[PDB]
Design a protein around this ligand. Structure first.
Ligand SMILES: c1cnn(C2CN(c3ncnc4[nH]ccc34)C2)c1
Length: 167
């Protein structure tokens, strides 16, 4: 039993809800929140800009030190950093950004990072400003993640479309 409330159950392990991941994180305080990161951990907009704003820029400060030490992430890769006031940990995962020409086949690799964590609160990778089809992102998620994932979809119209078209 965990503290996630009001989710629709899609599969054995995948759950989905129309929610702002920021507000959901601040209420649940999950062990792991997933950030929709880029390789530079520059958290300017989308989910990343929103999560970073909610940390009063502490996420960005921590991220800049991470990059200065380690260099950029790989597309499809991840790193674990602090969750600040939102979660114990933030798993920064880099899904491919279609608006940069990155290979969508890397989306499965991105979701594989979730399997290193027993329970996660997450957005749909490569959706939104990353330019991929969110219906596709959901299929790859369901077919790749085996741990318990609670997906927050900010846009209510998108949420209803994802539920109504789910196989
Ligand atoms: C293009 C259109 N939208 N997108 C991302 C943004 N997003 C989110 N998912 C859950 N919570 C959120 N809070 C703030 C943003 C956000 C999906 C890319």
């Amino acid at each position: 039993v965990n503290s996630f409330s009001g989710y629709l159950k899609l599969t054995d392990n995948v759950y989905i809800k129309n929610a702002d991941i920021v507000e959901e994180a601040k209420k649940v305080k999950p062990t792991v929140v997933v950030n929709a990161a880029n390789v530079y951990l520059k958290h300017g907009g989308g989910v990343a800009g929103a999560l970073n704003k909610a940390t009063n820029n502490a996420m960005q400060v921590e991220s800049d030190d991470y990059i200065a030490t380690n260099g950029p992430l790989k597309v499809g890769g991840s790193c674990v950093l602090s969750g600040h006031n939102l979660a114990k940990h933030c798993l920064h995962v880099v899904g491919p950004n279609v608006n940069k020409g990155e290979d969508i086949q890397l989306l499965k690799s991105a979701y594989e990072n979730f399997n290193q964590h027993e329970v996660l609160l997450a957005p749909l990778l490569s959706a939104g400003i990353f330019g991929a089809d969110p219906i596709h992102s959901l299929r790859v998620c369901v077919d790749t993640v085996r741990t318990n994932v609670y997906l927050a979809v900010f846009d209510k119209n998108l949420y209803d479309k994802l539920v109504s078209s789910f196989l």
